[PDB]
Design a protein around this ligand. Sequence first.
Ligand code: ATP
Ligand code: ATP
Ligand code: MG
Ligand code: MG
Lengths: 634, 634
Amino acid sequence: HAVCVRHAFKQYGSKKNPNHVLSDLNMTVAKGTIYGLLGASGCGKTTLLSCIVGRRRLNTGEIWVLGGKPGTKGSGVPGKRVGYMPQEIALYGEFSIKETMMYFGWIFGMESSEINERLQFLLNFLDLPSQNRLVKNLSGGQQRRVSFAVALMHDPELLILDQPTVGVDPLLRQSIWNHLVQITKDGNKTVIITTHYIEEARQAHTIGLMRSGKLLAEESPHVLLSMYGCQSLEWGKIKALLQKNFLRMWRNVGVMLFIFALPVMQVILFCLAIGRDPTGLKLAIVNHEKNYTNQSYQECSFDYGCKFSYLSCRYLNNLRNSTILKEYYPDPESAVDAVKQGHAWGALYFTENFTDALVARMALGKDADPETLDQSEVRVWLDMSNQQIGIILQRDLQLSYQDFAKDLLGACEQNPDLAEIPISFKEPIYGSNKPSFTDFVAPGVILTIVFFLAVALTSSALIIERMEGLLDRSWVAGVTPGEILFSHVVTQFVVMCGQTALVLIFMILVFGVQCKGDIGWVIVLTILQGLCGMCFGFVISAICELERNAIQLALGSFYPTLLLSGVIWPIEGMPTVLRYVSTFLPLTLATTSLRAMLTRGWSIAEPAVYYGFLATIIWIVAFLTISMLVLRFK
Amino acid sequence: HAVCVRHAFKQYGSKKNPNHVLSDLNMTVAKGTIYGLLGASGCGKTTLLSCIVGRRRLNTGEIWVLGGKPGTKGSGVPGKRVGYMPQEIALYGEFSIKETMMYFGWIFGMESSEINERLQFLLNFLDLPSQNRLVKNLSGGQQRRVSFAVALMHDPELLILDQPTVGVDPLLRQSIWNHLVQITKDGNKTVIITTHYIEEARQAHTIGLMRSGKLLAEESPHVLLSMYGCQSLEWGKIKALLQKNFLRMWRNVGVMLFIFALPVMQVILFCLAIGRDPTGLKLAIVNHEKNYTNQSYQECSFDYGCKFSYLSCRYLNNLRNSTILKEYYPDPESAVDAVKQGHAWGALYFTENFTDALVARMALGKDADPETLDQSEVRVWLDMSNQQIGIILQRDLQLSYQDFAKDLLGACEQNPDLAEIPISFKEPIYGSNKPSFTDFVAPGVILTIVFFLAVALTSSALIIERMEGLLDRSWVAGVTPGEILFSHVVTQFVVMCGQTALVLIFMILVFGVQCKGDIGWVIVLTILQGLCGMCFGFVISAICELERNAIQLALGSFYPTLLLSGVIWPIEGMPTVLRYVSTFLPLTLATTSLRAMLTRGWSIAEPAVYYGFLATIIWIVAFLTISMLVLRFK
Ligand SMILES: Nc1ncnc2c1ncn2[C@@H]1O[C@H](COP(=O)(O)OP(=O)(O)OP(=O)(O)O)[C@@H](O)[C@H]1O
Ligand SMILES: Nc1ncnc2c1ncn2[C@@H]1O[C@H](COP(=O)(O)OP(=O)(O)OP(=O)(O)O)[C@@H](O)[C@H]1O
Ligand SMILES: [Mg+2]
Ligand SMILES: [Mg+2]
């Protein structure tokens, strides 16, 4: 007995509308007989064959196949001893015949020098073109004959052919039916071929017949006649599914080269845009001591030395000569009317009696009457509608006043240290005295460019299996569903490391970013975050089913992981509850650890550093068990 | 007459290794005869039928069908007068039988009350289940029968069928072949049916035959059997494809509600995390005037009033009671050893004779000597390894010294105004005197949340057509390429406006981003900017065939948008070449216009405002013609 089923009960639909496809289904396939499962279009015929190879659970029946229940250690449904053929052509369209016969070649442990020893024989038996032609340009009949040879070469001992002769001319159909009757001559193989052409089914030995949810009769075709009628009929698996993932990238070279040009482009833009201070902003200076001529011109022939003359046009040219452009107006009421409509960013005003009011405010002290302490002031109106240019504009006018004040003392009377606020900031312990925005955000972006590029790579990898077919007919071949996932991790970790190192080269070597700490541990962490990123793209593909429903889910996680992590604002700005929640995240703790390597210089031994590795290894495992659990569930 | 081909030529293979599928191909279909195109498996049979309906173009030949070549206004190829059944079942599996009959119903201009009668008649004729059962839930023989009732209901005058009776039992295949005879009794319609089931092909009366790229015979069967052998001779279209787009968003309500929760979640996080001043951060204060006890106690009593005693403790409690914690150490060499290992963010130092050296500095004035200069300084070491917290700490110790200085002159007898540098900043013309980082990035993130969400929506739309079929046999039913794209804009612009207004409500009304200029124009710009985003996602789908290149291309074009538009840094730091290029972009000219509406208050009439509308309406047209040119001709 090859297959034997007792008391089979299956049905789809809700309890309010039962279907009742199968009712009893008591049959027995004697070993060595070409069992033929004929029937009527509409009954449960494929749903029985699909219940034999363990594709659908039988819902409280008894099924015994080649030793035991399907999918159990005592039977042989998944393995090299069971042939198969689906109703629809489940073949990958981008493979040549010589490649699709090797993908299934060494899944069943066939030697590479033995597959092609019979590939030519199979191509000669059933007519087929040259073996280098991809199976997408093949006709509709030469695509069925390939599927009949893919799952016949390994010489199984139980064939589950369903509709194998649909779409070929009668000569080829006779040739196909003249083969199942030759290999079965000895008691070694069984066939369960089912077809809808009953005339050709006379060659079988144990023709079955289904009428209503149960087998009607199972007798020889010439015994069926004269009783019911009168006349006529009334390492292998890993290596196999790893040269298919690698071959996929090579098939469309040109877009695979694009993914290697993304990190270099995304890093060049960041270094060339963010951080550099503005250098092309203007001002409206209306100094009322020099006669107003032209628009971009005014005399500045002040006195150079201990003689204090024309102090107004000495504070000018004492500020930055490159980040501020000077423009002159004759009327204070007109300068404010120039910044108002957007022709400048500010407007100064030096009163007519400025030098006298300032030379009498330093020599005289603590006796400054309000009249004297009202004309020595440099009135400035700022267009503070940008909150980032006005901040450096008002940080430059008064910082440049320090040089103006120190120049007075250091040239005439005393040591250039009186004009200093008593608070002295010494030398910073870790950083520099001139912080830059491009250095606070750089360590948090390198860990983010890598994370998102890895997510986009492995975002549809687990979802294209249904796209190309070849999946549900490879489950029968014994492919463990934890074995496809492993081959995706290996086949993409090679290409992820190729662009992770591209970010580091173009951000540390070409563009200067300090690396006071150890360089070995930075690389380990920056690929521990990429691998965590690509494992996050598997919990999306497994959960999602529709292709369009998974693009906008990973893409919808761009901003929330760019704000919740500390990238552009310190993590201490959030309230006391969001800050606590935003610590158990994949990226919020790696930026803090990497910031303590590039700038401070701490090694791994420091407690604040190894938390990044500890809190990113956990997420790798967490994103893997969930992805595996969903895959194993269905 | 009905169809005639003269001197047809077509080859598939590359140059110097041709295929030569067709050589001459001279045939003629009569006025009302059931032409049957039989032949061997491997010749050009489907590629001839697929060249009649205009799916493939001949190389050098003349094809003349229903009075003119395909694609000419005089010929009815892409019309309601041509039936068409493909070799493979090109049906959408998510539609019920009634829905998929109505979708093809009113493409040809069929009244909704007239389709139902034909639907019931066809369901009665060829056995089929209840009309509200999904096609994907049907069997393999009840899915072919549905496809037979779609290419037959509108009553065409030229039926084209290739293998319409495969996978169905003979008792019903005879019924199918018994229908093409009844409807063709008069000289109204023609049938061009190709089958490999030669036994039942004797019912026709113009059987053809192909051997190698040429028609062999075109005679009647019972004449063929007696010639050289004995036996075995070997508004509707828009309405149609718009209740199908509106329907696929109703079968996944679980995820359709998710896309309405992204904008509220992505805006709540931005306003709750970015902008707030850090509040929890410590200091190491080692004041050498009060005895050191505990570690959170310093006995701060400083003789409140005009009397000048314990000035060190007067400066303390004058910084901030909220944003700075205080921790006290007894040794200057130990405070630096606390900030060094991360237990603080700074370390002050008040010398044991601080008050005496400060009460004498404001009296001697210009007569100060270096002995008393370097004894009244609040030495502070700062951990500037964050560059964002150190800035607000360096800007708080000295800004709070202004209060300490004014607390002295304004205490006993003086006017609290001789403590300011001669630079006075007056009142800002447009902004406020206390700029915030959150108010600078908010007008420019709203334009980015909308842009990115629209791209995610309409980026898999044009590549999902090939997934569910219904496109090979939609081009035949007079569906021009223009109106497929148009119906993808109306069906998503409704759902994009539903989340564009969600961003505005949750950013202006609830969280409180000010808007001085005009609320009418902001909504127009933020809607007409999102529409530019959704049109950009169409150019991604038009030029990308494989779906795996859509997630990677769309998600990989995000960082080059934040870093190249002025979202987080004003566009003046880039070099001259990059700054000039960046203005000709969809977003960099629109954030500037929106920033001049919320902050300045300018209306549209200002010339710096309508450039945003003008420079993003162009991109809508530019992204549409390219998305249409590729879609029309490939
Ligand atoms: N896209 C293609 N590119 C190249 N060659 C092709 C392509 N499609 C088909 N061919 C080849 O050109 C010929 C066209 O075959 P065609 O589709 O007409 O066969 P058919 O009569 O439908 O086949 P069958 O009855 O065996 O299913 C065949 O030799 C086929 O191998
Ligand atoms: N996924 C499904 N959900 C519900 N009912 C289904 C499903 N698949 C098939 N059926 C129904 O189960 C019954 C048996 O289908 P089955 O696939 O066994 O038919 P079959 O013998 O292969 O058909 P045929 O030869 O006519 O193509 C049919 O009534 C079919 O409509
Ligand atoms: Mg079947
Ligand atoms: Mg065909």
